[PDB]
Design a protein around this ligand. Sequence first.
Ligand SMILES: Nc1ncnc2c1ncn2[C@@H]1O[C@H](COP(=O)(O)OP(=O)(O)CP(=O)(O)O)[C@@H](O)[C@H]1O
Ligand SMILES: Nc1ncnc2c1ncn2[C@@H]1O[C@H](COP(=O)(O)OP(=O)(O)CP(=O)(O)O)[C@@H](O)[C@H]1O
Ligand SMILES: OC[C@H]1O[C@H](O)[C@H](O)[C@@H]1O
Ligand code: NA
Ligand code: NA
Ligand code: NA
Ligand code: NA
Lengths: 317, 311
Amino acid sequence: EVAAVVVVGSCMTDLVSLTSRLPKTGETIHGHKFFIGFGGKGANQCVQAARLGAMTSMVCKVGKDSFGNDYIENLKQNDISTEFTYQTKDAATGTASIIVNNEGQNIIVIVAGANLLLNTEDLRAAANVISRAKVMVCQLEITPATSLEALTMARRSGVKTLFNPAPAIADLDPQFYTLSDVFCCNESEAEILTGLTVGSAADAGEAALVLLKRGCQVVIITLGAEGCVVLSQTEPEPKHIPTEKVKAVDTTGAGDSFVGALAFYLAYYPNLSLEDMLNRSNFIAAVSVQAAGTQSSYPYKKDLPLTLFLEHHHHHH
Amino acid sequence: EVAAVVVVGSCMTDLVSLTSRLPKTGETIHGHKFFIGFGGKGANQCVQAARLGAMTSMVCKVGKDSFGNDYIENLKQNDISTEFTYQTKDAATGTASIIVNNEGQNIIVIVAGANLLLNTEDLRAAANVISRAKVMVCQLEITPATSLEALTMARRSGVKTLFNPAPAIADLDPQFYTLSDVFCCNESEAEILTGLTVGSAADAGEAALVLLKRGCQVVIITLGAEGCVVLSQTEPEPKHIPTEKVKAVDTTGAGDSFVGALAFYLAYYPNLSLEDMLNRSNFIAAVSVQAAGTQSSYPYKKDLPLTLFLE
Ligand SMILES: Nc1ncnc2c1ncn2[C@@H]1O[C@H](COP(=O)(O)OP(=O)(O)CP(=O)(O)O)[C@@H](O)[C@H]1O
Ligand SMILES: Nc1ncnc2c1ncn2[C@@H]1O[C@H](COP(=O)(O)OP(=O)(O)CP(=O)(O)O)[C@@H](O)[C@H]1O
Ligand SMILES: OC[C@H]1O[C@H](O)[C@H](O)[C@@H]1O
Ligand code: NA
Ligand code: NA
Ligand code: NA
Ligand code: NA
């Protein structure tokens, strides 16, 4: 009955137009393809955890609109609990409108909409699910104050906090660091948070140490094809966890796959070393980059080697 | 029960994001509102004409998708004939992604989908209705060859041709000029068609004269808050027709309101001067800019001054 992974965050309808060029102010242009996808960092993370076998619950707000109805059905199709998936008449379901040219350069207009109306009253009603989970996951796509209250509730319940400061803003409220058991971001988010350049594993180590000293317990910087770099209060010397060369088709939502995998390991394989968890998380996110379509690319257990689900240490998947 | 205004053209689902600025290449920006609307230049024009009291027929193609089913219901709710509104499983209902900033400037990305499957066989079935109409209206959101055939059919029956070259193509087929009784576009479309700058009513006059010489009978360039400029083969001196002074909330589809009003007046008030018709058409379009969306903002006859319907 009880969800082990609770995600408090964002659901967004992806509205994607492919064109030969991006438009200038005042321009009407013809694209050659349009498609609707299920996105939002919160839902993407929740979906990857659910597909690995996690019992998950998605605490979010969508609209009382067709896109919101379709989102609830998407979460139920991935066996995600929608008990505290709220629907509001007061705004539309969140949108990410994405225009992509032939070369892969894009413009993105996000309207967070109903996501921003998820409030502290909504979290109090969800308090039974949040307090009884193993892991609480949050990002920066809903109201900051709401993510902070979710982190506060999880901390006082002894629930592990996994925070993804995405998208990043430079002067983040210091409590996001001190309430984070695991603080996981990418290279460009690390640059925004620290003002430092991340062009190597060594540079990622230096950025992670800045983040650790602001009060995080564990800091992970994802490095795309370079894997990730990790350190912690107990082991402050950074480690580089590389990942084998694969043929990337579409990396969109790779970080969300990585975070959802990590939530799954924290919740169901708590005795694995952190480096083992991240090595597994790298392999699962690298499966996602080998196919198109964000949530569509996130593998299920049946599609993955069984060594990813061993109760003891295992290195090569 | 004869349709006086036949529109051969586009239906789109409008997916609209309101933002404080437009994004540059590589940029993610956060807007403050998202909404769905029934759009497409053809359907917008047809809806404005219908709401003024025109008997209209919409010749178009949508998808056998939820958006297309919703579109057909939208046309029936505006009392538009859907006799020649077709549905295809081989392409989705057209989409227009619209980003609008707080100064009212926009970018639009159209994926025309089922619009581009409306073909000359689909037009042939409408031959009787086109031959009995007063006005045929076309734009550039379907296959150009299909609009050219609709204008050709209209010209054969002596039906008035109203052509809106929107969105504009720099290399427009010369027959769009010679088949147009009334050729109506906005400032930026006039720039694309002529390669001239249009930064004033005087500049619009010069662009309109280039368009007149390519063989249009009448050229109208819409000028947003400045109203429109018109000239003709009989009176090639440009005339500036100002519009009503109003507070603009959402100008999206203002030109479609203007063109639908123009279609209504050509069909039902044929003896009005061009200046009178554009006076009226400006007033109606100026009502549309005072509210959100395209069709949702288009006024009905009952809500407009009586004098717009007198002669
Ligand atoms: N080209 C590639 N080959 C193998 N694995 C990759 C990869 N790109 C990404 N990954 C995997 O996904 C994780 C996250 O990737 P990345 O650092 O690019 O995050 P991201 O998707 O958040 C950046 P963005 O926000 O721009 O999409 C990596 O740590 C790695 O495990
Ligand atoms: N700010 C405003 N105030 C009053 N009337 C306006 C207006 N903007 C537009 N209109 C009316 O709408 C008509 C059409 O205007 P315009 O040519 O800007 O529309 P449009 O929708 O075609 C331009 P675009 O494709 O760049 O959005 C004008 O002739 C005028 O009557
Ligand atoms: O003129 C406005 C229309 O043009 C685009 O086609 C949109 O669908 C919108 O409704
Ligand atoms: Na990410
Ligand atoms: Na992918
Ligand atoms: Na127009
Ligand atoms: Na309007």
